[PDB]
Design a protein around this nucleic acid. Sequence first.
RNA 1: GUUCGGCCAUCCUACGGCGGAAACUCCUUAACUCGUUCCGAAUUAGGAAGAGAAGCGCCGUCAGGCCCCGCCAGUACUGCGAUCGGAGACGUCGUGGGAACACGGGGUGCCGAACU
RNA 2: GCCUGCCCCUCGCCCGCCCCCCAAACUCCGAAGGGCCGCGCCGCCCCGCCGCUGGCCUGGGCGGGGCGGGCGAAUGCGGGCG
RNA 3: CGGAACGGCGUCGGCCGGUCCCGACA
RNA 4: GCGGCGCGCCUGCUACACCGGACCGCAGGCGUCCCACGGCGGGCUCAGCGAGGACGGAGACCUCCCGCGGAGCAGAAGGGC
RNA 5: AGCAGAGUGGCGCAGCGGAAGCGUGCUGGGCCCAUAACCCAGAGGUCGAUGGAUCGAAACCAUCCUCUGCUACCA
Lengths: 197, 165, 289, 55, 150
Amino acid sequence: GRRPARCYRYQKNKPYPKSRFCRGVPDPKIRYFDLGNRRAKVNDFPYCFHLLSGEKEQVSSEALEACRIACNKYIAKKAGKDSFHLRIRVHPFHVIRINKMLTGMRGAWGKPQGTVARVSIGQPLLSVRCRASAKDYVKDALRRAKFKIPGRQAIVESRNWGFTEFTKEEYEDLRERGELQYDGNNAHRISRKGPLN
Amino acid sequence: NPMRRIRIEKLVLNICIGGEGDALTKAAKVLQQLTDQEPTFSKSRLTIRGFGIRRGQKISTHVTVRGEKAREIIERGLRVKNFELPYSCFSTTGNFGFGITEHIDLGIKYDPSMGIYGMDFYVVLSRPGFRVNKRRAQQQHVGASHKITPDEARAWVEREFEVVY
Amino acid sequence: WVKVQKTRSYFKRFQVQFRRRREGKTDYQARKALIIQDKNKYATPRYRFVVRRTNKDIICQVTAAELTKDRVVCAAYSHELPRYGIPVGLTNYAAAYATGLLCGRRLLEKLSVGIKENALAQLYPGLDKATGEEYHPDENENEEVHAFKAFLDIGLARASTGARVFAAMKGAVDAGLNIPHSMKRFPGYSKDGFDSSALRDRIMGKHVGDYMAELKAEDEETYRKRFSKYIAAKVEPLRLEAMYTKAHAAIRANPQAVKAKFEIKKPVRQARLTLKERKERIDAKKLEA
Amino acid sequence: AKLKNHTSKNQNRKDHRNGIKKPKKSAYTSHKGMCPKYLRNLRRSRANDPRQSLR
Amino acid sequence: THSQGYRCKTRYCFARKFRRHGMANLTTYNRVYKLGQYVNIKVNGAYHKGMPHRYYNGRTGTIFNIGPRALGVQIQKRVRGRIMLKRINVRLEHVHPSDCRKNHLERVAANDAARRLAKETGQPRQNALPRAAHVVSIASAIDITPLKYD
RNA sequence: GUUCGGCCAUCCUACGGCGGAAACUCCUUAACUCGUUCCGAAUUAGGAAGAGAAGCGCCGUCAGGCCCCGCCAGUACUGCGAUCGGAGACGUCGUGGGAACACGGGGUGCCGAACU
RNA sequence: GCCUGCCCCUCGCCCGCCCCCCAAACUCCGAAGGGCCGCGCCGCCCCGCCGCUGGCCUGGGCGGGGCGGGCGAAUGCGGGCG
RNA sequence: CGGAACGGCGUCGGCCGGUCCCGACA
RNA sequence: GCGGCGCGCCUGCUACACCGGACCGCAGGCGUCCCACGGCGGGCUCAGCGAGGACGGAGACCUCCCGCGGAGCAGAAGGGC
RNA sequence: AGCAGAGUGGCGCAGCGGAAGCGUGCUGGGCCCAUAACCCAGAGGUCGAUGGAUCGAAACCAUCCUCUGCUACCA
C-alpha cells in the first residue's frame, strides 16, 4: 500500500538487511518460497524452466507474492499440483524506507515501510521443475507471472536435468554409470572423497 | 602388562547440605572424622531462590582421599549398598560413583546432636602412566590405548570390590 | 545425537602454539624477559644459566641465545660426577651444588684458556670450603676482568625453598660465576641470620645420612630396597661427607671436559609408502568389498 | 543561512604549487631527542685529539 | 568523523591476521639495530604500550637513536604544503628491519665483483630494451578462430 | 636420543600399528627441604623394585585440517580514454591490471650449540 | 493388540548430509588502484678517543690515515632560502 | 519524429526446429 | 521558532584498501566506578559438549574427559589477550 | 506528529533491589427469623509484551504494544 514502486526500482541504496541496526521492518508479504511438491524425488520432474531477469531492478516482496500465486494457480489447474515444484529464487531481504509525508527534509532518515529483493541480470528470479504433463503448460504459466514482475524477463528451459547442476545428458550418464546418487530433490556427481570402508 | 594395571586414583566424598550454615560445619567435622583429612567447603556458581541459595553461599563440603585410607572407605560404603552397583553407573571415561544416606551406616558413631549426613562417594580410576595429564611440562593427554574404558572398569571392580551388576 | 566439537572449522581456526610450548619444555614469557637486553648494549652477548633436573641427572649448561639458534659455551652434567667421586644419588641436593661447581669451574677455566696473565679463573678461585657464606663474586673490586654474569633458569620447576636447582646456582656462584641471587630460597634462611650450617649440611648431604639411619633402625629390609646402589657401592652414611669434600675438591683441581664414546644406534626407520603402494591399498578394500 | 560545511577541492593543487618541499638538512642530522647517554658520551668522546676544540 | 580518537578506524590495521594471534617471536627482541638502518614500521595490536599511530603503519623510516626498550625512528609525513620529518619512539615489537635498499646493497657488491673481475681478467639496470630478432618454428601452428555464442 | 634453541600446523587433530642398548619418560618412597581452597594428584625432597602400556619416537589412514601447484578464467571486478550504444538501469569498445570460492592433482617440518 | 503399561506406528526436537538466497556497521580469502622507502662514492687495513657499554683481547659511536676501485636506471630540468 | 511496461499480418534480416517427389480417407 | 544538541569528547560505519574526507547521516556511549577492579611475583584455566555420582529435578555440588577461548577483563563499541 | 508521563489482585490504587500491601470485590464460618451492616477468616496481581543486567528486575534502561499530557501561524 502507498508508493507506486517506481520510486523503489533500480538498485540505488547500499544493501540494508534487518540486522540489529535496522528494526521496525513490517513483515514481508512473500512467505512461501517453496511450493507444489517440495517433497519430490530427483529422477522425476526432469524438465526445468526458469524466469531470468533482464534488468537490475528491485522486485518488491508484495510483487514477489503476486508472481508466486499467478504461476502456482495456472500450473495447478492445467496439470497436477504434484506435476511441478516451484522455487522463488530471489528472497526479499533488502529493507526499503519511507520519510513519512507528515517538518520536512530536516531529519529525513526514513522509517522502514517495506522489503524488496535486488535482482542482477542472469539471475533466475523464479524456477520450476515439471514432469512431461506440464512440460507445455509451465512455459505460458511463467509468462502470466512475468507481467507482475517489472522489466523485461526471459523464460528459458534449463538444459540441466531438474534442479541438478548436471545437464540432462550428464544426469542420465552419471545415473547409468551409477556414479549418481539421490538427496531427495538433488544429486551429487561422485561422492568419492573420504575414508573407504 | 604390569604398567597397564588399574588403580583407584582418588575418592571424593561430597556432602551438599543446602544453606544450613553450622550443619555443613558439622559435616566438615564428619568428613574429617571418617577420613582423618580436613574438608574443603564449596561456593555457589549460580544463586537460586527455590534452592535457598545466594551467590557464594556455602552449600557443599568435600575431601579427596587418595590411597589405602580411601580404598577402605569405598568398601565400608559399598557394604551399606550391599556390594551391588548398576551396570550403567560406570562413566564413559572409566570412573564410577555411588551415594550413601546416613554417615552412621559407614561405621561412624551417631551422636544424635550431629545430624545424619548423606554423602556421595565418587571414585576416579587411574593406571600407571597417568602422570602425563597433570605435569607442568609435557602435559599431553593419555592415549586411547592406555585410557580406561567403561568396560575395563566394570570388570576391575568385579575382580576386586566383588559387586553385583 | 551428539555434535562433534572438533569441526573441520575448529581445526581450521586453530593456531598451533610455538613448537617448544606445544611440547611444554619452554616458558616463552619468562625467557622473553630473560633474553631482553637494552638495545644500547647492541650485539654484546648476554649469558643465561640453565639448570634443568631430569629423572636421574641434574643438567647444567651456560648458554647464549643467538638469532638463529642457542649456543651453549660449556656444560656439566651429574653423569660426570662419578669421574670426580660420587657414584650414587646423582640427583641429590649435594650433586646439584657439585654439578654447578663443575659448571662454573669448567667455564672459568675455559675463559682463562688463553689469557695466561691474571686470567678469569686466576682472578677468582671461588670459595675453597663448601659453605653458605652468602658468597658473591662481584662484590669484590674486580675491574679489568669481572665475574661472568649469568642468569639462573628455574625452567618449569617451582622456585621452592631448598630446591635442587637452587643448590646448583649456589655451586656456580661458589665457583665464581656471578649469578645474581638472594639467599632466601636456599635451606637455613630463617629471616635474619642465615644458618650457614644448614646449607653446609645439605650441600654435604647429611640429610641422606640421617634417612639412612632411619631405615637402619626401623626396617633393614626396606633399606635394602630403597637404597640398593647405596648399599651395593661402598657409600656409608658417615663417609658421604668426606666424599663430598673430595668431590668439590676434584672439580676445582681439573674440571675439564673428557668425552665418553658415542655409538649411534639409529633405529629401523620403516619407510613411508609410495603413491602406487597407497593406491594398491585403496584397491584391496575395493576388492574385498 | 546555511553556508557550505567543508570542502577539500583545490587543496592538493594549492599545496603542489610549491609542494614537496623537503624538511631541510638540519632536521635529518639533528641531535634533538636522542638518548642523553649517547649524546653525553659523544660530547666527551669528541673532546679528544684532532676533534677536541678545547683551548 | 565525529570520533577521531588515537586508535580510530584501526579495526583492521592494528588487528593480527588469521592465526598470528599470540606473543611475538623472540626474534623481534633479539635483532640488533644499528643507527641509520632503514626500518619499516608495522603496528601489532597485542603490545598496546608504545604503538606507532595509524599514519605511521606501512611507512619505512630510519632509526634516529637506539634507546633501551624503544627504537626511535624518523619518518617523513607530508603535511599539506611541506613534508615534515617527525621523530617518534616505537617499541621494538612493532618495527621490522626493512630490506629496503637490499637491492642497492646487493648491486654495489655485484658491481664491485664485476670491477674485481675486470682487474683479475675481464678483457672485453637497463629498463627492458628491444626484443631483438629471433626466428620461431611455425610448423606447430594452431589456427584459432572466434566461437559462436551459445 | 637428551638439554637449549630458531622459524612457528608440510610441524596439527583423531584413531590404529611398531618400537627402545643408552637416553627420555612412566615408575618406587616420603626421614627431611618444601608443598596442597583438602589430598606427595600436582608439587618438593629421597631414590631405583619394575615398564613399553602410555607420553615420546617411526610407519598407516580413497582421514579431517594444513602447505604447494594446477584449473577456475582472461571470468568476476576495476585503472584509463570513447560524439560507444541504450528511455533509463546498465552494458559494450580501444588501452591497461587481474581475483576468489569451488574443483583437480601432489605432498605432510626442516634448520644450529652443547652432549652421549 | 495391554490392572494400566514398558507391545509399539507417525511427526516436532536433537544431530548429520545436502540446498535457495544474502549482509554499510559479517569476514576464509582478496584485485584494480594508491601510500611509504631505496636506486653510489663500497670494500679492505691499521690508528686515536669515550666517565657509554662488558667475562674479555667487548660492542658501538665519533674521528685520522693508507690500500683498492669509481660514476655504474630511463627521460626531462639549475637548485635552495629568507 | 521526449518516453515506458506492453502490443503489431508494416517491411527487411537472422535463429531453432521440423513436414515436404513417399507429393507438402484421400 | 519548537523539538533536538556532531555546542567539548569516543567506538563501529557512510568513507569509495596510505592518510584525509560532509550531513539536524546511521547504530550507539562519556562527564562516572574502583586501596582495589592497583603494582609485582607465584600458581592455576575459562565458557562449555558428553559422561557419571544420598537428597537432587528446568538448574545446588563433586568428579572425570575433550576443550583456539565459544569465559572473563567496572561501564559504549571495536580491537587485544 | 515531535517531545514528555502511564501500564500491578476483578476494580481503584500502593509500592526502591530482595514486601508485591490497602480498600473493596469474592469465597467460606459464625452473629440474626432471615437479608444487610457486624466479627472471625481465606484466596487474590506472568507487577502491559520483548529484551537486557548485578550474579536474582514492578523497579534499572531501551524496543514495540497500548493509552494519555501539551504544543510555528504568519507572512
